[PDB]
Design a protein around this nucleic acid. Sequence first.
RNA 1: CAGAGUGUAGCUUAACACAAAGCACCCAACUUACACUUAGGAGAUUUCAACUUAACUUGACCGCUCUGACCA
RNA 2: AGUAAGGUCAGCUAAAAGCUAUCGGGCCCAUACCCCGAAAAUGUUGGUUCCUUCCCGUACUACCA
Lengths: 140, 49, 137, 238, 60, 31, 157
Amino acid sequence: AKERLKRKIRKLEKATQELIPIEDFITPLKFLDKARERPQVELTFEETERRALLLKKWSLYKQQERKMERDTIRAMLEAQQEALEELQLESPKLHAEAIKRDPNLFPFEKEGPHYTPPIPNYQPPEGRYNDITKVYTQVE
Amino acid sequence: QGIKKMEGHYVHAGNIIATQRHFRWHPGAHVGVGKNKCLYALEEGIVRY
Amino acid sequence: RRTPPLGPMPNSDIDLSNLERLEKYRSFDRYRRRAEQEAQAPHWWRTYREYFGEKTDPKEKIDIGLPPPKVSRTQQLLERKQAIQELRANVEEERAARLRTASVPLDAVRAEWERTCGPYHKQRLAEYYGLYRDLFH
Amino acid sequence: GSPWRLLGALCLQRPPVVSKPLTPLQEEMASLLQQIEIERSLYSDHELRALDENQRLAKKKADLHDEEDEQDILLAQDLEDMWEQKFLQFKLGARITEADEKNDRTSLNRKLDRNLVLLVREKFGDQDVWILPQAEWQPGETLRGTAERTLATLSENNMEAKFLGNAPCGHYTFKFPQAMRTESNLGAKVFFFKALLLTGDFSQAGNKGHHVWVTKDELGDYLKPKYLAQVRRFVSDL
Amino acid sequence: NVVACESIGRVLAQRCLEAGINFMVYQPTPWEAASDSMKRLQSAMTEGGVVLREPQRIYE
Amino acid sequence: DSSRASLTRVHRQAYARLYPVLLVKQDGSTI
Amino acid sequence: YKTKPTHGIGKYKHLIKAEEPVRAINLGTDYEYGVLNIHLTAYDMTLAESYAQYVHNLCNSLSIKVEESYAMPTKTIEVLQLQDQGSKMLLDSVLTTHERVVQISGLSATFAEIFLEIIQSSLPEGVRLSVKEHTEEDFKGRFKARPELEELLAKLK
RNA sequence: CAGAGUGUAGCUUAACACAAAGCACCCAACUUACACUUAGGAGAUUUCAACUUAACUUGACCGCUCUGACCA
RNA sequence: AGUAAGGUCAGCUAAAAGCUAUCGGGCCCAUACCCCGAAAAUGUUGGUUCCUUCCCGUACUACCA
Ligand SMILES: [K+]
């Protein structure tokens, strides 16, 4: 009995494992349904020209933003390297200790800015949370 | 299978320069490749590698 | 039996310890461009151009033409930049280029080609046709 | 020993609290993207419900069959009106705080949309100089350890800071003004470490006006020329 | 631009007519052939008069 | 910052219409 | 040929990594970091995907090896609210949470601060940035469950 | 604040002229994403005087980087 | 020694079933029989989707001087 259970467990371990499907990429049948299809409205020549000009300006703006980000990263890297070189020249031991990795650096969690600051006088209402996530299992 | 005409030899049109199971020599100028990787001369001249 | 290479072997400067780190020819176009450049570069081993490539005298061909004209490069560049800026500022040109309906004046293009690049193209065509080989040896 | 004095400084920065307002170009791009999404999208459940309600109202008006229109009892437009009324009743928070109007550079509540950097005023040679918080390095202690100890040496602050790495992000070297220039003490070399202000602030007693939280643009008002030039190299304003 | 490619094709077709090059070949990659710029250039050359397919060699 | 990748649209070929909505957290902030 | 100076001029497999017909988690050195995972969590799928794409492009431009770019299963949660003057919590709404994961490796100790600062400054609103160390636990959790295996293990117990 | 070195957009010993080039970079479509491809965009000779000619040689004026002064 | 073939619930057979063994009920004064309900496996390895490695046991030959 024990040997048979071990054999079954080994067989199931050898059996391949299936990844959980992603509903973000899976297209539901609601989209396939033709009722949700809407009539299409053509765009005027002026609207198309304005969209093209806006796209060109946006391309230039994104190029400028990328240039600014690259310059900032380069400045940070140069400053850090110069500081490390100065620290090494002044005292090699401190530089050697500083160039080591930080094990406490990567339990990293950060939240982005909110549209509005939290309201001190806000009182959240009473409610309940229910999880209806579809559980996917592999058998046989 | 091997080279039938070494470098500097004189060949005519259609002479089989070489035959190979896999591509060891590739067809060059005025050299054709057969159905079974057979390099033959399309022009009368001198073989060069 | 082994014989050392006469010169530097191909791909002898690519480090193999950083194979993953080195950038790759992700585009067939870049691979083909590099291959063409390498083929154009001379090599000590036997090559196709050695036997089939045309062989010419190493001496430079003696010029027997008129002295070249003199053009103010700075002024020419400034004028061309101003003309291009005016053309791009013209809104009709931008919309025509965006809608793929613009064209060029063939007569003006040919006149400017004759004035600027015409003699050199004619000389190249004459060299291809072999006139200088026969007329002036 | 060494002629230079080892000093470790801390670049305490509060990240922006609210999102930066969009430029007009970004607003136009967002409007275009929303319009494209609406044009290329399919009918939503709400749109289908509204269309079905309109069709059933037309059926009620024209034909005798009514189907009782229980769904049309509460129309989609009526639900939209109720949602709009609820949104109007609800009030959002104020992005611009009283500190922005007061120009009080001691409170963290000002300029929630931009990153802030902390500066402290210390008296050197009977002269008040605004610098980043700093301490003097000690044997058997890392430079990052000194930077962390600067927080402890700060007066009446309850704050949590997250240090990023161990390598300093910048340095500034200066020499004495011939008042105490000596072979033993030629000058000093401060090193800066960037940290993130997760939570906390100073106490009421600590808010005595000796510390200011300022942006990169106004950092030069308090910092010296050379000190500001060195600090701006690693302090970003993206 | 595609207009630039078409203009280059037209100018080159006229120059080839002037030089006597009435036949030639083109060797495009699949993506270049599917590209609209190369299609416009080929159309311009053909309308100018250049044939993009050389006649077969006579062996007898 | 946020504006670097805030301007987005649905990349799915087929997708229902989505309405922009302000979401209010328990502390008073909104997204 | 072997005897000729031009021997082995056509070698190509030495320039190409072995064409193998799961993966050991690399651990960084004293000045390097191991394989890390950046799983951005957001209620907006479009924002999450856009920021994941931005992070991947930034890593490619900064020459940081991106091991993988995938997504975790969407979590669907029903948010309910208690009705006024009643004792029943009606279904207020339904929300979806998405988690776009970028698996990278080879991050330098010195450049780690700069990379984290950039990716936290560029973080969009409503998106939570979470950088952790890649684990076999997470790799297995990416997969489904095996109730038959669970039952057999319980029987073995 | 002074003394040096110093000069094409990001890089190049690209620019003989016929000409300011190649590569790098960004946006749009496909791609989970990356990548490839298709379709679009932005760029520079720091400024003057010297066979006027000269990005190119020679000097000033600028800009950049170090070195000293100043320095908490 | 070299040739062939088998290994299946606890036992024995079959192509994933049957009879007993066993658990839990019923009848019985109580057991046995009987009736009802169940759990109970392809020796094993790696494949292909039937072969094959190893282990256990089985049969035959191992001769002519
Ligand atoms: K052959």
